[model samples]
Target: TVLDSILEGVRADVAAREASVSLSEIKAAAAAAPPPLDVMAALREPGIGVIAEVKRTIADPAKLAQAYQDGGARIVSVVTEQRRFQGSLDDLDAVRASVSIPVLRKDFVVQPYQIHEARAHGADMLLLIVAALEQSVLVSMLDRTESLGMTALVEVHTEQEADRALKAGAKVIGVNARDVDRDCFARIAPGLPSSVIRIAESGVRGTADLLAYAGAGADAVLVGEGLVTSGDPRAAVADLVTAGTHPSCPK
Candidate 1:
């Protein structure tokens, strides 16, 4: 897949960068790292992907990172923004090392510089939130990612935002069901339009939730908290996968 090939390229970029400087030095310098693979292609795979995200405090980040990888997550999103999300770039680096799957830097990206920062830190993808940016800025970010040979995911909440994102050349669009800034978990249907690769994000609890999103035309879903809080993250993923596939027959 184009996405997989892009990810392989990202891994290669990380390897090349590692030879020049120690990971610590790179982190300290906050230098713009290489870009991750093109993430949009990954969402176009045969199955509905389950993208798992890991958000950590200053506390034990390793445990949560391990659980996400051990579970059935094909892609992992690491929050890299500091103030609003309380996430760190270090976590992105660490989690990338911990798992073979792709790592996404989930941040409120407002500048082209942050895209490079995310890629340099071993992120296979970057998140572009439409709410925090204007149409011109969003287009520039998307163009910048293409220039760097990196992939970006455009996150939108409403249909209007979705239309704007698609117009901005967003190949992959994320529909966040919950409000992360306020940490309000609302289980609302994304109601995303067809044709584009619809990825439902936030507040996805189980098979039922996954199925509903699938039925609504989502190509993939990013799940957290629910799987983390579940007794068995792996089992939870299995159930979600099954439910997303079979769905419920109309009575």
Candidate 2:
């Protein structure tokens, strides 16, 4: 599978990182780091929220994150895939240092070690893809994230995965691009509890798609590669923000 391919590479990089720093050392740093912000509360707000990911080809990560914050993005998602995407844990540090809004570490996490590392870099949110882990590890990792006082956006593409996440006590469920055009949000939304935060992720064509997802019961849109590729990031994000406030949804 495509994901397994990424995970193999992801593990190699994880091995490199683990070699450079001891487990106890990073865990201590995480404990010493400042407390996390309220990502759940931010998403739970009335209007459709915007969560922007930073992997700009040539922009400063920190400054770009500030632009996102200034543009009314509810949260900033920092990709830390490391082997590619110019995403290091340091970039997570840069984004977290630069933005007052909650920051999310978007990566393929398979262990509790990664969760500790996320908090050490000041990530208030963590991405836990439901397809990436078995039920035991998923529940354990979710529990560890809670222990660190961070929010988890449990990514799922199908109703079955959403059910798995719910059983694992996930609070936020991300419906990504693979299932976007198939009435995913509406189908999964009905199965999800009202308290669970719904996020439409990884696909952003324009304000039209943003409106489409917002109308489908997504409380937020996680704008993808289309976001930073544009000439003006702030204005584009603000435009999406405005579209999210469309009167018809009232969702």
Candidate 3:
């Protein structure tokens, strides 16, 4: 599977990086950084939230961060995987410096070290793909993230994975439509814990998609290619923001 391949390389890279920077040093950096934002609280607002992603190829992620914030994005997600996504922790830092909203480190996070690294680099949240981790690992990572005052946006592609996320005590769950072949949001969003933040991720192209997911009970939507590839990302995100918060849309 694609996740297996990604994890193989991620584990190696994490080991190498950990050797260079001890966990204690990373913890010290995290300790000195500002506290993470209240992501769950942001998602619980009256309407759907928008989490705009920063693609690695973006010329100026810092500028994009500010644009997203201006477009009413509740959170900014930065891709930080070096191999496939061509992103680095530096991008997360740059985006963090440019926006006041919470910043999420979007990557194939496989270790506690990466969680520490994320907090050290000023990320308020991080991604934990359920398809890529065992339940034990997922639970441990979630605990580790909370220990550092950070949030984990647990990504799941199936109903079973969603159940696993809830079992792991995930307060915020992201349903990635890219992995499912049909009715992705409908099949997964409704059954989630009422108190948990439901995030619909990927395959969101316009306000239509936003409205569809919002109607399906998504508290927020995580959009990437659609916004980044648009001629005017600010306007594009604004449109979704409006759809997400429409009075008639589902809460």
Candidate 4:
């Protein structure tokens, strides 16, 4: 309900600013840029495809990028939130150009206009968080995203949010283990059953955590700071996938 109110405020602003942005503008922009790697296709296949993130200053950008590639990451996310993370639009653009995998523009999405900006910047997909927007807005954004021939990765932290995202026709859902309110991170969220194609996000330090998610029916896992900060990203990735394959967790 609080999120709904927040979205209402945002929509009011969007309504005031509508200038009839054309689809041709978006399509032309995409066509001018090199194509994105098939991130969704990679995720659909069995086993885990690490969705790595490139933070601004916390880690070495070039090193993290190479580690993700070396570890066979299916997709990469660029943190574009400018305040707390010191992330920038340039970081997203650079990472997308540097890597062959699909790239995500990871930020607190407040409007559909940001979606167009993301696609124009060469993002292969959009991240829509249930906690940040209303159910109606989420549905509208998903519809628009599909119309553009792009993928939407809906992120939810609770069962209610999950159901709402499902109602919005989300095909890929990410369940973050970190509690945004408390900023606490867990290896996994408790009591999640296998059903929807889930992607486990956050606090996944090693293989056991990955295995736990696989056991819980996660199709993929998105790892960021852990692998990016590791001394041996390659080994870290190997260990994570190995742990994910525990008999109880096998996909």
Candidate 5:
């Protein structure tokens, strides 16, 4: 399966990193680092929140972080995948150092070592794709994330995956819009608990896209390529901030 292939690569990469840094060392670093911000609280704020992503093509993560913060972004997402995404833990560390907002480690996480790596690199949250792991594994990773004083943004692509996320006690549920359509949000958002933060991930380009997802019950939007490819990311994100928080599109 496609997921298995991805995990295989992730496992090899994780093994190499673990050889260089022991788990104990990583745990100590995580313990000494600052505590993670309350991401759930930030998402539940009055208006719709924006999670700006640092793509592989982004030349300066610190500058992007400043721009995102200036544009009222609630959180910043840093892609850590090495092979395809051309990202690394260093990028996440740099972004975290440059911003006060919570930083999400967006990667294909399939092991406990990766969880420790995320925290050691100063990540406040990490992504868990429901389709990539078994239910038992997802539950275990979610528990581990909580024990490490971090949050998990469980990503799901279908209604079945959403149900699995709920069963795993996920507080933040992000519906991927790549394979699914707009109706996917309408179907899954209504079934989620009010406490669960509903996030629409990928394929959100402009204000119209953000408004459509907001009207369908999205509390936040995760934008990567859209903002990175924009000639002016600051202006693009500012426009999204205004549209997401518009009066007519109440959450």
Candidate 6:
């Protein structure tokens, strides 16, 4: 019920794109799109991985993205959304071309149509929030991602949602900070399926914040200003790059 308002906007925006591009058209393009690599295989390694963000429907970015990877970013996340959010699939493709790392299409993915669009544009990963969809739709989504040789980041904010993601067969889970007790919620989840790679997302600034998530059992933390800020960011990236992994955390 709470997500319905923004979900309405995303759905409306999706319908607009649906009118502009048909289903078969996207699938055909997907056939020609570059093959996506298994991002999970890389993040599953030890040490907290850096998930750098780039959301700019606004312009050219090969240089910026290259810098992140050069500074040791493991994966790149691109926002391919609109209406309230600014970005297009073109940006996703642009960043994809610029980085050797797998690019994550971090949009509000609702319908299967968006998945085809993301694949057609060569996204290596997709982001799906548990709060945004019903379980049946979510499971359907998981199967589709597997079929495309693409992995998905099932984003969750609560314990029940984490269970939903686990039950849906999520291999990578994104723990966003948003709870009645926000910080503790995403950082600490008891009974989480150990095999699934857990990544911390949001409000990450300094190395101090990074260590907190790393200590809390996160396999990775989405770097905030370290990669997505203005020019001269690689230095910021370097500053926030070292977070040790705990053996107690799942591999």
RMSD of each: 9.3, 3.1, 2.9, 5.3, 2.8, 4.4
Q: lDDT per model, in order?
A: 0.68, 0.86, 0.88, 0.69, 0.87, 0.80
Shift of residue 72 alpha carbon in model 4, Å: 1.5
* TM-score: model 5 vs. ground truth: 0.94
TM agreement with the true structure for every prediction: 0.74, 0.92, 0.94, 0.78, 0.94, 0.90
Runs with alpha carbons beyond 4 Å of true place in candidate 1: 1-35, 57-63, 178-195, 244-251
**Tens-digit lDDT track for model 5 on 1-251?**
88788789899999999898988888888888888888777888977788999877577888887788888888999988989889989898899999999999999999998998898888998999999989999999999998888989999988899999999999999998665475677778989988789999866888898888888889999987667677777788888989834556545
lDDT of candidate 3 at residue 90, scale 0 to 100: 89
lDDT of prediction 2: 0.86
Model 2 residue runs over 4 Å out of place are 179-182, 244-251
Please write out the lDDT profile of model 2 over residues 7-68, one tens digit for every residue: 88887777778788778978998999999998889998878889988873745899888888
Stretch of 10 with least lDDT, candidate 4: 181-190
Best-performing candidate as measured by lDDT = 3
lDDT of 1 by residue, 138-176 (tens): 899988866766667888777677778888988778877
Deviation in angstroms for 94 in model 4? Answer: 1.1
Residue 179 of model 2 has an lDDT of 30
Candidates sorted by TM-score, best first: 5, 3, 2, 6, 4, 1
Candidate 6 has what TM-score?
0.90
- What is the per-residue lDDT of model 6 for residues 1-251, given as tens digits with 9 covering 90 to 100? 75788788888988888887888898898878978988988797666788888765336656777777887888888777765557788888788888898888888899999899999988999999898889999999988987999999999887788889999999988888764455644434555778888888876877778887777777887864635554566766665665442233666
Clashing pairs in 1: 6-37, 33-120, 34-120
Cα miss at 204, model 4 (Å)?
0.3
A best-first ranking of the candidates according to their lDDT comes to 3, 5, 2, 6, 4, 1
Residue pair clashes in candidate 4: none
